[PDB]
Amino acid sequence: SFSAYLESHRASLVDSLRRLFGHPFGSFFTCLVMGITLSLPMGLSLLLNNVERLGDLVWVERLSAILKLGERFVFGLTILLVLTLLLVVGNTIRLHIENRRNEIEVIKLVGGTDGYVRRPFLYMGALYGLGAGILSWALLAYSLNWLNGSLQGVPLDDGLSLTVGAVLLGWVGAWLAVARHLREL
Template sequence: MSILFSGRATGAKANRISLVRRFLMFFVHHIRQALSSLGELWRTPAASFLTIIVLGLSLTLPVTLHLLVKNAQQISNSFAKAAEINLFIREDASAAQIQSLQTILKADPQITAVRHINKADAMAEFQAASSFGEALNYLTENPLPDVLVVMPANTEPAAARALMQQLAAERIVEFAKLDLEWLTRLEAVVRLMQQAVIAIALLLLSAVLFIVSNTIRLSIISKQAEIEVMKLVGATDSFIQRPFLYTGLWFGVLGGLLAFLVSETLLWGLRGAISDITSLYQSDFQLQAMNLYEFFGVILLAVSLGVGGSYLSVRRHIRAIEPSGP
């Protein structure tokens, strides 16, 4: 009985060792075929280089447009957060009335801050900013009104407009101004750019898929005799297909890296021009480059296109290759 149990234990241990060995050999075979397919790219540099260039540059346009849209959204959000309502006070309003309105507005939960610009300060600021200079000294009276600058708690355009209309009804307010029309147009342009990015990306990525598929098809045709021999000695279709799928994977990795480098180079070239523009508006806006998640997203997309294009080709053409008769 003890011999029987000992034999079963030995058999179970041998089975476990066999499973572990097969599991390790599975990964060894995959690593070997992956490295072999990378070497195949090196042995055919012209065709491989052209495919990588096409894949990388096709990804560069949608990636760059995405980064531009992201930065445009950042600009839109930063200006939306800085939305201010200007309340122009009537000429006949007294200082006590202005102070009373300012106190009431500060207590309003819809408002985060209120700043009073009196007419004298407004004239001094206008004289310093304008090119009229000494000519303004000849005015007999100050034509500028007192202004209350109100910062709304909710800076969304619709909420800010509703608050502006409410404040414009105050008795000593001549009129209120909220310049958000340009911001609305900017948001519309950003939405249009988002839709354009999606449309352009779909067209270019579809083209990349077919280009990779055609490249793999040509590679399969060039190795038809080798594939026939492999099938004669018992190789399965999945074993034969694997190197071509790894070739598509390498196309994707290298093409994604190229798209990243080119898009970052384009953004780097734009930084100087954008810095000159933002300095004119006294803004501290900084162009946002690709973050880590976006980088891995680009690589994953490129790999998906490479492997997908390869799969479309190998599933059709390798099955069609059969060993010729004697």
């Protein structure tokens, strides 16, 4: 039933959360790293809005000309780090997945479902990504103040998009490792 499939998914998230509490110290440093990598990543995507809202006469003409000039310089540069984000997500996901393979082996031995396999890790990836991304939208303003103290909050639409790649990561970057593990069988 769809209701059980949710309970299946629900218990899947329950176990995923256990695993989150799992390695609570290891996962503590790990989520620290997850949010940290996100923050290192999100800062570039954030500086785009910084420039966008940033806007004598000797340099006034140059400022007028700079329109659309660096626009590509960030439009491309953001896409680049997205790849590295996917990379770290896959690396961590595979590292976790490789652990308890023998358990997974026996699980397969009894039987299984890709979802019975997938959800335990897919939910985990989505959660790690979402948490790191939220931490990004948070720390953005803190940096903004620590700087303008010498500052802007996340716009609502912007904060709304802040979760998508996090969701995208937990939907796909894991699905990347999914083949690398399943086709291994």
